[PDB]
From a paper:
In this paper we describe the first crystal structure of CNMT, an essential enzyme in the core pathway to BIAs, which introduces the amino methyl functionality that is often essential for the bioactivity of most of the medically important BIAs. Previous studies with CNMT from Coptis japonica showed that this S‐adenosyl‐l‐methionine (AdoMet) dependent enzyme can N‐methylate a number of natural THIQ, exhibiting highest activity with coclaurine 4 and heliamine 8.8 To further characterize this enzyme, the C. japonica CNMT was overproduced in E. coli. The CNMT structure reveals a typical class I methyltransferase α/β Rossmann fold forming the AdoMet‐binding domain, which is capped by a predominantly alpha helical BIA substrate recognition domain. CNMT forms a dimeric interface made up of 13 hydrogen bonds and 3 salt bridges, similar to that seen in the PavNMT structure.
The structure of CNMT with 9 is very similar to the N‐methylheliamine 8 a structure except the two ligands are flipped relative to one another in the active site, with the carbonyl group of 9 in the same position as the amino group of 8 a.
Numbering used by the authors:
A (entry chain B), B (entry chain A): 7 to 357
The structure:
Amino acid sequence: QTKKAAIVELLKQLELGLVPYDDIKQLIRRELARRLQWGYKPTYEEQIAEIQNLTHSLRQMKIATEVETLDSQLYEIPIEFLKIMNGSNLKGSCCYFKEDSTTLDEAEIAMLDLYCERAQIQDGQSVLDLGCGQGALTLHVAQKYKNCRVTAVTNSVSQKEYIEEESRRRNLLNVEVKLADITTHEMAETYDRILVIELFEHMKNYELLLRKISEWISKDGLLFLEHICHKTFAYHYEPLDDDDWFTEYVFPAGTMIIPSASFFLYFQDDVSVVNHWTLSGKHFSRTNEEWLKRLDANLDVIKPMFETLMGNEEEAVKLINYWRGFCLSGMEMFGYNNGEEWMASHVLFKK
Amino acid sequence: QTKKAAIVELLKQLELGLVPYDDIKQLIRRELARRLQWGYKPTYEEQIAEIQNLTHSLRQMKIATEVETLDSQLYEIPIEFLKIMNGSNLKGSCCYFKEDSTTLDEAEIAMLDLYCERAQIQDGQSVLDLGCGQGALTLHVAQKYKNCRVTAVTNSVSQKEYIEEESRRRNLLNVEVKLADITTHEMAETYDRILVIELFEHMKNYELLLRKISEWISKDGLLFLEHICHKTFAYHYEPLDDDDWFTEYVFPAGTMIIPSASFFLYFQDDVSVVNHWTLSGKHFSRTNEEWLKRLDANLDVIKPMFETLMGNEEEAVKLINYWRGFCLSGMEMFGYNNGEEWMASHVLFKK
Ligand SMILES: Nc1ncnc2c1ncn2[C@@H]1O[C@H](CSCC[C@H](N)C(=O)O)[C@@H](O)[C@H]1O
Ligand SMILES: Nc1ncnc2c1ncn2[C@@H]1O[C@H](CSCC[C@H](N)C(=O)O)[C@@H](O)[C@H]1O
Ligand SMILES: COc1cc2c(cc1OC)CC(=O)NC2
Ligand SMILES: COc1cc2c(cc1OC)CC(=O)NC2
């Protein structure tokens, strides 16, 4: 009764930044632990059954609902704010920290290099970057492979822009950006290597999506895929119950899906898995931590920025405290259990 | 829908010189890449079948179409403009760059020397130069082959000009020039060596043309031909689709043909191939590059020249940017993939 009110009192305290970081982390692990209790099953038969029920149900849905409440709540973020929170490459995804001494910028370059290595991109190929974001991978591949023909795809208007100027500003011609919704977009072109970095989490019907992406692959071409995940169970990001405030704490309802590490192994109707890697949840946990440090370290420039974009300081506070919850959610979630619960997954496909 | 209108806007920007060189080359490579995908075939059978479709279709057309409307939009250029863009010999065709420090003038001489070598021109012979242009080849062969008797043929009153005066301005006997349309011209004289440098690209029925040219060959005489090409497929210079702006960007519609390197091996009804060479596309690429440099470097003299030729500044701007797009298309097309796609071909025929 009143602990639903207690829940709607916690969220207000978080919106007003009244709750210390440690207390936030503590409350998060509680909901994380409750998630694991909900996810894990007593027998392995039930565990595999749960993965089957989810894979079968998604094949009845559309490629994606959520599609234009999409990135108005998210991804349509002003570029001037991302250059403060993110690294030099503006990578809005997981970064790779090999040593404790690894900076955010170094971590960004690490993942990008590992992408080219596991996707096996060579100097004379045509590359496709679905959900390119701010073009962290596009600009990186374009410069490192002068004879490549990278093509970035986005449904975001300001994401399509920053790439097109920063590509020309960096002396790059290989770069090409298209404005389209991958859910309903069709193209008669074909590429040697298709790169998808944390895009499927937003989709639903993976059979239809992979069927569409498969047709864009050149023969002897390869499809590389990264997606954050749990190592065992998968599930829609819908609240566990009355007390679950953490699920919809950052991402809007019905916009997220957390696959198991073996999830896309059950979607090989048009593609065939060649190689499969996982990656410690620490890498993303540290990534959000470095993002969090840059927010607090630059509140002097971020605050007036949010005041200008908003209309009042009140909602300028709710916004800065949202991006804190964003970083904090990523920190404690992927760093949970020594980063051996929620983590990243790399899959390499062929035609 | 809006992609058709997006193209006409681009063409207008190019006319008014509002698009930087790098975005132009980038947009060209995209179309170039699109033509390669359209040209290359998955099976060699279909690749050979395409060559046969074009070779057979040409044997029904007339020798040439759009004959004097090709003489109007092009090849009737004021001589004082060519002196600035072209080299010393005014060679309106591919030049030969042996090493990186080769000048334009050196390149013009390099090709001309290579012509006499592969044509095996010797002092006491009668030479015919079909499509002489500004007589870069005629004057060259005429000078230090004093006992030769060069004869230039042109349908351009402007080209029949410069040669004659600049032939006795250098004190030359051999040079003799004719004004006629090769498409319809008959002649009862016969030569020891006929030289055709990039003329067949404007023609259609090669069987009828080579049948006529062969009649002008003295027995034990030779026919040397140079033609730009692609190493594999051939095609009319017509738009791929409505999104293909590059095809009719430089040359007027229906006035161009891009032969295969092996194309004129299929037209040996009256002539017989003796030798066959190709030549890297980097040669003509650098050639158009040197031409482009000479344009921008002499805009202080070129502009007032175009203002005088035209009637207003608006059309003067359109014209200079045309020759810019002329050289830009030449650079990227022949320089594409290290010049191993579109290139030049040399063929030596006997009767
Ligand atoms: N329905 C949709 N259609 C096209 N792009 C979408 C999409 N839904 C999400 N995206 C894009 O996919 C990206 C996922 S976030 C990943 C960004 C980028 N790949 C990086 O690593 O930095 C977002 O930038 C968003 O713009
Ligand atoms: N139908 C036609 N009849 C006679 N000459 C033609 C012709 N169509 C094109 N030409 C000539 O062929 C030339 C092709 S451009 C090549 C010019 C010269 N051979 C050089 O290498 O520099 C043009 O100068 C043009 O005047
Ligand atoms: C809140 O941490 C997350 C960050 C990101 C994703 C998921 C996150 O939490 C599960 C996936 C994504 O599309 N972008 C980055
Ligand atoms: C635009 O580059 C070209 C230049 C020339 C030709 C073709 C070109 O492009 C294919 C052939 C010709 O008759 N004259 C020169």
